[PDB]
Amino acid sequence: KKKVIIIGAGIAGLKAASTLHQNGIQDCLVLEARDRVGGRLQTVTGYQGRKYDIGASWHHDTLTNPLFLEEAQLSLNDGRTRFVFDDDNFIYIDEERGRVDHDKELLLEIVDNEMSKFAELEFHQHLCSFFQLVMKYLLQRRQFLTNDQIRYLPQLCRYLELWHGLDWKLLSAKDTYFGHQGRNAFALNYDSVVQRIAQSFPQNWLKLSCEVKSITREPSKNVTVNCEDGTVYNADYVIITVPQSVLNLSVQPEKNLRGRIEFQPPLKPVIQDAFDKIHFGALGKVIFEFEECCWSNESSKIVTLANSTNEFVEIVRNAENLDELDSMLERETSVTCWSQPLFFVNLSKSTGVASFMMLMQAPLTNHIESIREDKERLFSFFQPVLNKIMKCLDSEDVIDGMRPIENIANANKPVLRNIIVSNWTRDPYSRGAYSACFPVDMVVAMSNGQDSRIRFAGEHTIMDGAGCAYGAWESGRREATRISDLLKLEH
Amino acid sequence: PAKKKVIIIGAGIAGLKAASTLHQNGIQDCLVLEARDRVGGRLQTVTGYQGRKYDIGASWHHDTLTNPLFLEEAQLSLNDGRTRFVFDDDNFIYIDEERGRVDHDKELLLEIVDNEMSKFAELEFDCSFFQLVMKYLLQRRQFLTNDQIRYLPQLCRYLELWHGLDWKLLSAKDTYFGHQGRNAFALNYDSVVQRIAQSFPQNWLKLSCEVKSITREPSKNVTVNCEDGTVYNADYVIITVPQSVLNLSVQPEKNLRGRIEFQPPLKPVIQDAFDKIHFGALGKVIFEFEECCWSNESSKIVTLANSTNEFVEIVRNAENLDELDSMLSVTCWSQPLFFVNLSKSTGVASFMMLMQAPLTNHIESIREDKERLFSFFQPVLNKIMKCLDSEDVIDGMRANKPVLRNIIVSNWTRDPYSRGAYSACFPVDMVVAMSNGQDSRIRFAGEHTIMDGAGCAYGAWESGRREATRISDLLKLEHHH
Ligand SMILES: Cc1cc2nc3c(=O)[nH]c(=O)nc-3n(C[C@H](O)[C@H](O)[C@H](O)COP(=O)(O)OP(=O)(O)OC[C@H]3O[C@@H](n4cnc5c(N)ncnc54)[C@H](O)[C@@H]3O)c2cc1C
Numbered sequence: 001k002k003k004v005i006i007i008g009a010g011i012a013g014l015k016a017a018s019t020l021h022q023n024g025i026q027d028c029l030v031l032e033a034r035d036r037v038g039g040r041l042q043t044v045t046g047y048q049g050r051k052y053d054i055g056a057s058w059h060h061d062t063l064t065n066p067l068f069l070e071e072a073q074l075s076l077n078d079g080r081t082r083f084v085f086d087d088d089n090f091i092y093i094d095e096e097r098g099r100v101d102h103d104k105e106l107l108l109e110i111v112d113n114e115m116s117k118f119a120e121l122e123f124h125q126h127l128c129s130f131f132q133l134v135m136k137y138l139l140q141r142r143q144f145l146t147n148d149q150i151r152y153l154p155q156l157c158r159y160l161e162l163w164h165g166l167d168w169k170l171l172s173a174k175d176t177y178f179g180h181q182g183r184n185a186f187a188l189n190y191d192s193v194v195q196r197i198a199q200s201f202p203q204n205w206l207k208l209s210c211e212v213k214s215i216t217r218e219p220s221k222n223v224t225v226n227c228e229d230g231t232v233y234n235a236d237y238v239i240i241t242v243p244q245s246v247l248n249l250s251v252q253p254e255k256n257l258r259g260r261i262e263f264q265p266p267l268k269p270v271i272q273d274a275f276d277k278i279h280f281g282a283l284g285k286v287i288f289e290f291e292e293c294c295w296s297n298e299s300s301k302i303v304t305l306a307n308s309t310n311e312f313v314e315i316v317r318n319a320e321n322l323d324e325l326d327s328m329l330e331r332e333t334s335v336t337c338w339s340q341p342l343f344f345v346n347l348s349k350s351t352g353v354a355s356f357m358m359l360m361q362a363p364l365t366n367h368i369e370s371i372r373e374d375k376e377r378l379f380s381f382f383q384p385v386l387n388k389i390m391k392c393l394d395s396e397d398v399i400d401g402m403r404p405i406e407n408i409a410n411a412n413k414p415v416l417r418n419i420i421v422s423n424w425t426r427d428p429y430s431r432g433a434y435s436a437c438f439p440v441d442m443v444v445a446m447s448n449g450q451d452s453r454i455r456f457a458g459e460h461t462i463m464d465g466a467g468c469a470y471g472a473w474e475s476g477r478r479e480a481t482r483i484s485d486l487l488k489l490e491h
Numbered sequence: 492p493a494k495k496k497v498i499i500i501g502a503g504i505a506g507l508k509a510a511s512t513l514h515q516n517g518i519q520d521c522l523v524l525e526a527r528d529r530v531g532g533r534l535q536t537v538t539g540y541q542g543r544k545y546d547i548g549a550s551w552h553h554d555t556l557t558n559p560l561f562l563e564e565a566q567l568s569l570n571d572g573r574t575r576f577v578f579d580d581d582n583f584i585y586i587d588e589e590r591g592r593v594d595h596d597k598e599l600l601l602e603i604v605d606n607e608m609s610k611f612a613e614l615e616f617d618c619s620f621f622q623l624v625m626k627y628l629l630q631r632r633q634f635l636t637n638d639q640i641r642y643l644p645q646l647c648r649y650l651e652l653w654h655g656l657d658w659k660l661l662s663a664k665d666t667y668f669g670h671q672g673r674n675a676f677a678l679n680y681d682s683v684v685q686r687i688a689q690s691f692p693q694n695w696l697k698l699s700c701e702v703k704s705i706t707r708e709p710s711k712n713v714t715v716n717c718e719d720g721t722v723y724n725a726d727y728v729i730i731t732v733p734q735s736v737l738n739l740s741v742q743p744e745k746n747l748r749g750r751i752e753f754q755p756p757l758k759p760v761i762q763d764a765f766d767k768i769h770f771g772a773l774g775k776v777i778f779e780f781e782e783c784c785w786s787n788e789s790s791k792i793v794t795l796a797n798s799t800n801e802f803v804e805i806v807r808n809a810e811n812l813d814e815l816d817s818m819l820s821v822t823c824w825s826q827p828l829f830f831v832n833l834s835k836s837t838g839v840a841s842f843m844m845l846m847q848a849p850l851t852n853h854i855e856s857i858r859e860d861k862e863r864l865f866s867f868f869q870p871v872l873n874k875i876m877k878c879l880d881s882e883d884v885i886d887g888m889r890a891n892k893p894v895l896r897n898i899i900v901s902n903w904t905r906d907p908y909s910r911g912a913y914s915a916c917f918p919v920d921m922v923v924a925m926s927n928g929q930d931s932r933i934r935f936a937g938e939h940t941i942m943d944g945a946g947c948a949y950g951a952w953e954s955g956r957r958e959a960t961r962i963s964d965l966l967k968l969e970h971h972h
């Protein structure tokens with residue numbers, strides 16, 4: 001009855017639909033499990049109506065990003081603002097020492113650059129965790145590092161944890177260091193991107209609250225699709241764009257799992273084997289909304305470093321080898337806001353909004369999202385880093401005003417009015433893990449499809465832009481174009 | 492003629508390491524012939540005001556993560572606690588004559604777009620560095636502010652001091668590249684030279700012998716003649732004279748200083764390689780002051796050449812590259828200049844400045860006119876002192892003010908034994924031709940004969956080790972049964 005059935009209304013599924021329509025293909029459907037489109041692209045509303053992209057927020061690799069270039073062309077043609085280049089000189093804060101960035105003595109950024117080079121050479125032509133790689137660097141280069149560099153550098157370099165959404169002891173060293181193709185551009189409305197694409201094809205194509213539970217290849221070469229609500233569909237081709245984490249459920253037994261799709265026949269071994277990798281990270285976000293800005297806007301990029309110790313330095317100095325270094329690194333807790341690095345975006349400088357957008361990594365992410373409803377507890381957890389940031393930004397301790405009390409004595413003090421938290425690790429339609437946005441087994445299997453009728457798209461199905469919004473976007477255009485060409489050739 | 496096992500021509504670091512390696516491998520009766528009355532070649536440490544020392548040739552150990560020469564020096568320091576170098580990389584201070592400092596500027600963010608420029612170059616790869624920058628500007632104009640477009644190109648040119656060549660003459664394809672780790676400022680490259688020179692029989696060195704001819708004999712030996720008439724015969728010869736001096740061999744005129752007459756002549760593959768390589772010239776000027784009375788915030792300072800708001804206008808209006816090029820007296824502000832503030836890194840009240848061609852050739856030609864040198868650089872020197880919370884410089888070459896006591900200038904473009912061809916230190920035709928040699932007996936070493944570390948002191952060092960080892964491997968066969 002239908003030419004193509006797209007499962008998932010994320011950017012991958014939406015672009016696919018936009019492409020099909022663009023190429024004159026009719027009678028298509030987009031089945032989405034949620035009651036909204038966008039998927040991992042979701043803009044939420046907070047205090048005084050302020051908006052924030054709780055999912056994707058930046059356009060990466062702007063020198064080659066096709067989606068960004070499309071957005072840029074639009075703004076060049078209508079002068080409307082669709083993004084802002086917010087890269088900045090990072091401000092690094094240690095709880096005890098305060099700012100350690102661009103330090104005339106520490107020169108941490110310079111040694112971090114050496115660390116990245118060290119990583120590049122370590123895996124050159126290679127066919128270890130991030131933590132171990134850093135320890136290797138310190139042992140090898142200690143003769144050329146001051147005491148404070150050995151102490152702070154490892155905590156600074158961990159900003160990469162926020163790129164991968166994963167702790168350094170769990171992140172693989174080989175996939176940690178990589179370069180981005182140009183500046184990043186903060187999207188001033190990824191929802192505006194979702195909207196434009198979503199409205200580029202006929203409305204009746206969209207079917208929300210349609211949780212696909214099964215996909216079958218009929219003997220008549222037709223593909224049947226059934227949603228939880230009982231509805232049944234069939235088409236010439238199907239483009240599956242559900243997240244890798246959801247698709248992974250298909251290999252497990254019991255169709256019970258929310259989101260899990262029953263494949264008949266099952267996904268071929270090439271696909272199944274591909275899941276034996278990835279699915280560990282989890283990027284989370286916490287938005288702190290203040291009444292107004294009363295802090296320095298020197299930079300829109302701030303990172304708080306986890307606590308470090310001088311004993312750590314003594315150990316690195318005394319260790320005779322890696323094994324002895326590990327052994328010595330055994331002291332004698334409870335996780336606090338200073339137990340890991342945290343990345344804060346000072347939206348005041350970049351967008352003029354008196355709010356901070358903070359990124360966190362697994363294992364913290366899961367823990368914080370699990371208490372996302374307990375605002376008082378959230379404030380207590382982050383209060384110490386929030387106050388240190390304010391102190392370093394020429395301001396003062398944050399006033400908890402989530403339960404407001406108009407008081408003129410707060411005039412020039414930061415008053416927190418609301419906290420917003422992501423929920424991706426607890427969302428059954430996203431669940432699984434997170435991967436950084438990069439400019440192989442899974443990519444090959446996915447881009448290869450189940451067969452000539454069952455295709456796949458999404459951020460986990462492409463090389464260029466892997467784990468990126470533009471990658472998912474491009475992967476959608478890819479599958480749609482492949483099918484439109486085929487349909488056009490039929491006659 | 493005296494018989495020798497191996498004769499090395501040139502006592503720069505390549506020749507010295509070759510000799511060092513030959514001795515290490517037990518090879519006897521060798522000789523090192525050097526035209527100058529000193530060893531070291533392009534590694535020369537001079538003395539100035541109050542006995543202060545400066546490397547007027549190579550100064551840094553580059554690519555310290557893998558540099559074998561540096562690693563050897565580091566091991567020595569680790570064992571005797573003696574200081575041989577200092578990691579002096581720093582946050583660069585950028586200065587514009589009118590605007591003053593423009594580094595780490597919360598609004599200009601020049602360092603960030605410079606990084607994008609670099610990535611642009613990477614993804615791009617042949618034209619000139621200048622043209623590549625112009626292309627970047629046209630492609631990214633929509634995402635660059637007016638002041639970014641004005642100053643970025645001038646900041647990008649710090650790379651001119653890496654290659655010692657103006658951006659319009661510099662190959663864009665060879666402009667951008669990354670070093671393997673931080674740099675280490677040698678605290679006496681002369682100490683490196685002395686160590687290596689003392690590592691083989693002292694009777695092997697013969698200074699003041701300008702070699703004028705090398706002849707491959709039918710008996711398979713090689714005859715080497717010094718201009719003073721002395722003759723030597725050897726089984727193998729390792730030639731380490733600079734590429735520019737070797738180039739003389741293919742030109743007619745035997746009276747040319749340093750020129751070696753080869754018989755038979757250099758192979759066509761070698762002769763022809765002299766067509767696509769070299770063009771720049773890295774120069775140095777040392778400014779010695781009585782004492783430090785300025786800010787030691789950083790040891791790295793770069794003065795940007797003058798720019799204009801008209802340039803920005805042109806960039807915005809240009810319809811394309813063709814329309815851009817159409818729409819588009821030397822002073823210290825006509826090109827970028829790189830200054831090393833030694834007070835912070837070494838504690839010495841002096842500035843070591845690097846310059847590029849064509850300026851280098853002009854300045855070295857007038858290095859004897861100190862007053863003229865002072866007047867030429869006085870404006871950048873003053874702007875620097877101002878930005879470092881100081882005052883104008885007082886000429887004291889003959890309290891809270893900087894007093895210039897002396898100026899020292901390099902001489903590589905005028906030195907007949909170097910002839911400033913200069914190339915940047917990087918971690919193909921000439922290399923292959925050189926590494927393959929003239930024949931089994933006539934070999935070559937030097938910074939221009941190796942891929943890894945090409946143009947670097949450690950590259951020259953390694954090339955010497957390579958030729959000495961090859962010869963040792965061959966001589967090894969003489970003891971087989
Ligand atoms: C916290 C976070 C921050 C990020 N920040 C950035 C950033 O700054 N820049 C960037 O480029 N990228 C970023 N990303 C990545 C980017 O958001 C994703 O690459 C992109 O949105 C993935 O799009 P997609 O279409 O492949 O998948 P999705 O957007 O996940 O869409 C797939 C759709 O499938 C639906 N679905 C699932 N199961 C079923 C089912 N059984 N039946 C029907 N429908 C189903 C889902 O509900 C969903 O709408 C971020 C990701 C996260 C989690």
Ligand SMILES: Cc1cc2nc3c(=O)[nH]c(=O)nc-3n(C[C@H](O)[C@H](O)[C@H](O)COP(=O)(O)OP(=O)(O)OC[C@H]3O[C@@H](n4cnc5c(N)ncnc54)[C@H](O)[C@@H]3O)c2cc1C
Nearest residue numbers: 501503504505526532533549550551702937938947948951
């Ligand atoms: C201004 C400047 C700055 C530099 N800075 C750095 C730096 O910071 N880091 C770095 O790694 N590298 C640097 N270099 C490069 C480095 O100095 C060279 O790579 C290295 O010294 C070259 O060594 P070589 O042995 O190949 O040649 P040379 O050192 O030139 O030695 C060859 C020798 O041959 C002799 N000779 C020539 N003709 C004859 C003849 N006919 N008979 C006998 N002897 C002859 C010469 O007098 C000379 O001593 C710099 C170079 C210059 C010019």
